């Protein structure tokens, strides 16, 4: 097996999600089905899916195009809020593990109020007082530190409580903050927003209290260039600092498009992967709505291929992933007729790479991933899922497992693909078609016979029999192994009343009779073998039938005319033997008949055959 522990667990989860859609059940939450395995690994992966769920848990317009949802200002706004809610809660967990040694340890004693937690967080991260703080303290801590880390944790209420106990010190900041907490989308009114920004810009552009600076332009979304590096030293603190500063419809203003493009264009992977920590960059792209970038990026880490494919599937089963129309493009690209700030993922290629790894010895699991390509076609029109099953069968040669083995008793035990579509007639011909083009007739027959395509089964069975008609049928020979399959196809084609056009069909049952004629001839059962050839009315034995038999030879399958030489000789040698054992006249007359027939028929080795036939007739007299 080519699948690692983690990859295998995901496969099982994707089998469920397929079993549900294959039986018409409720469309379960894919993101939940993937996070179910994440908990079996380190929390590096669990915290990823947590971000994936929260970033995709946005009210969408079902049955709407992918590009439309992702271009709409409506959806683009909720992404920023879902991310900020993740950066705030994520930071809140950092503040817990900073005070208590373990999340469990914090829980048993009880998570304290965000206010008392933050206070018990300031104790550690600033033990001694910084001399540059302003506006005094509140219950033993600087008022601005409390406000910042409370807003950072996302509890505006806890921050407003701090403000209520410092009404005299904070001046007019109270009426401004109380408006920020009330107004939605973390934005103030243009009039009041103007009043505070100008005040900050007036004489507080450079204040000795960094926490004061941070809060002001987090509330006013100002000084976008100043990264407030004094307080936002971590990467998440930067993302959170900026997403609280982005704006929507000219100076000192930043928008999501600029920010998202500004980040990866100027500070690409190189900047965010110098510490050899891959998820750091992924979180930067995913929490900025650049899902295709983050997916391709994370898909290149050979250790995190599994995770990047699935986060692509989630975005794909939620009409959020922007697929690349052309299949000839690179993995990541920007369509020419699209804005430059969005990118597109060649989803078809993405799955095709992941599959090649475990498609060789783990076919069942491969199909589960090929199903997501059911909705796509190629330039030639083939259904992508169907084509992927053809290529996977041509390579793996797993016919019984994937296509269903058709035993020699008339049964068709369904295969693994039967689960996904009930119309399995084309691919069985596709797989049968190539194997036919590769001279693998004995297989192409079994495959065509699996799809009950007798036109092709009998055609190929005619080719495999004609060479072996006069041969000696011996144990385990190529004659027995082909005759016995032909008879197993004769019964199942009569018991089920199946037949190809009379040309193909007539020749097929005719060869089977001839194969019996030589099997009796090679055994010495002369009398019995003579009777068979007489029924077939293939070789004339009375002079009257020569005219009609000669005309019939003209339109009989060349697979029959080929073996005419051996038939005449065996029949002659049959009469020849019976002569040495009135009757003499009758054999003599029949001997003549064979000669005149052979004389009027142009066929294989007519030279040596016509001569031998005449000699055997002379010895009779």
């Amino acid at each position: 097996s080519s699948l690692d522990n983690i990859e295998m667990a995901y496969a099982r989860q994707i089998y469920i999600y397929n079993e549900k859609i294959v039986n018409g059940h409720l469309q379960p939450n894919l993101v939940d089905l993937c996070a179910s395995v994440a908990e079996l690994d380190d929390k590096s992966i669990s915290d990823m899916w947590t971000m994936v769920k929260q970033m995709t848990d946005v009210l969408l317009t079902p049955a709407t195009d992918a590009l439309k949802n992702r271009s709409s200002v409506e959806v683009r706004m909720e992404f920023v809020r879902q991310a900020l809610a993740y950066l705030e809660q994520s930071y809140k967990n950092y503040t817990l593990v900073t005070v208590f040694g373990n999340l469990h340890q914090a829980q048993l004693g009880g998570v304290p109020g965000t206010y008392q937690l933050v206070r018990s967080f300031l104790n550690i991260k600033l033990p001694a007082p910084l001399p540059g703080l302003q506006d005094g303290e509140v219950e033993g801590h600087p008022v601005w530190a409390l406000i910042y880390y409370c807003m950072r944790c996302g509890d505006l209420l806890a921050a407003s409580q701090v403000v209520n106990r410092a009404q005299h010190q904070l001046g007019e900041f109270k009426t401004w903050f109380q408006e920020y907490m009330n107004s939605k989308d973390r934005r103030l009114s243009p009039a009041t927003e103007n009043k505070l920004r100008l005040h900050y810009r007036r004489a507080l552009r450079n204040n000795t209290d960094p926490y004061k600076r941070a809060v002001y332009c987090i509330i006013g979304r100002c000084d976008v260039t100043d990264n407030q590096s004094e307080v936002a030293d971590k990467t998440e603190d930067y993302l959170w600092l900026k997403l609280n500063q982005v704006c929507f419809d000219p100076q000192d203003r930043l928008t999501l498009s600029q920010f998202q493009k500004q980040l990866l264009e100027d500070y690409g992977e190189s900047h965010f992967t110098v510490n050899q920590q891959p998820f750091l960059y992924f979180q930067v792209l995913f929490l900025t709505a650049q899902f295709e970038a983050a997916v391709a990026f994370l898909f290149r880490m050979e250790r995190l291929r599994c995770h990047a494919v699935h986060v692509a599937l989630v975005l794909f089963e939620l009409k959020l992933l922007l697929k690349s129309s052309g299949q000839s493009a690179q993995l990541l690209s920007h369509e020419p007729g699209d804005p430059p700030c969005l990118r597109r993922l060649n989803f078809v290629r993405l799955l095709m790479l992941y599959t090649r790894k475990f498609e060789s010895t783990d076919p069942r699991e491969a199909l589960q991933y090929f199903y997501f390509l059911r909705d796509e076609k190629d330039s030639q029109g083939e259904n992508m899922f169907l084509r992927c099953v053809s290529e996977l069968v041509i390579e793996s040669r797993e016919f019984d497992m994937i296509l269903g083995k058709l035993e020699n008793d008339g049964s068709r035990k369904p295969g693994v693909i039967d689960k996904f579509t009930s119309d399995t007639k084309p691919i069985i011909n596709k797989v049968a078609s190539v194997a036919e083009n590769k001279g693998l007739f004995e297989e192409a027959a079994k495959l065509y016979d699996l799809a009950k395509n007798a036109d092709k089964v009998l055609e190929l069975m005619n080719k495999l029999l004609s060479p072996v008609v006069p041969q000696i049928s011996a144990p385990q020979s190529n004659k027995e192994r082909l005759k016995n399959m032909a008879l197993s196809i004769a019964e199942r084609y009569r018991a089920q009343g199946i037949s190809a056009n009379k040309f193909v069909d007539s020749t097929f049952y005719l060869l089977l009779d001839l194969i019996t004629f030589f099997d009796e001839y090679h055994s010495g059962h002369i009398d019995r073998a003579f009777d068979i050839i007489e029924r077939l009315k293939l070789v004339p034995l009375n002079q009257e039938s020569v005219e009609e038999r000669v005309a019939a030879f003209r339109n009989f399958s060349d697979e029959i005319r080929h073996n005419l030489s051996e038939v005449l000789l065996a029949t002659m040698n049959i009469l020849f033997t019976q002569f040495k054992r009135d009757r003499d006249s009758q054999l003599r007359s029949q001997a003549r008949t064979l000669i005149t027939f052979a004389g009027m028929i142009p066929y294989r080795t007519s030279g040596d055959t016509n001569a031998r036939l005449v000699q055997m007739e002379v010895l009779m007299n």
Binding site: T235, Y238, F272, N275, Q277, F279, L280
Partner: peptide, 8 residues
């Protein structure tokens, strides 16, 4: 000048 130090 954003930092590259992940929250640990």
């Amino acid at each position: 000048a954003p930092p590259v130090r992940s929250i640990y």
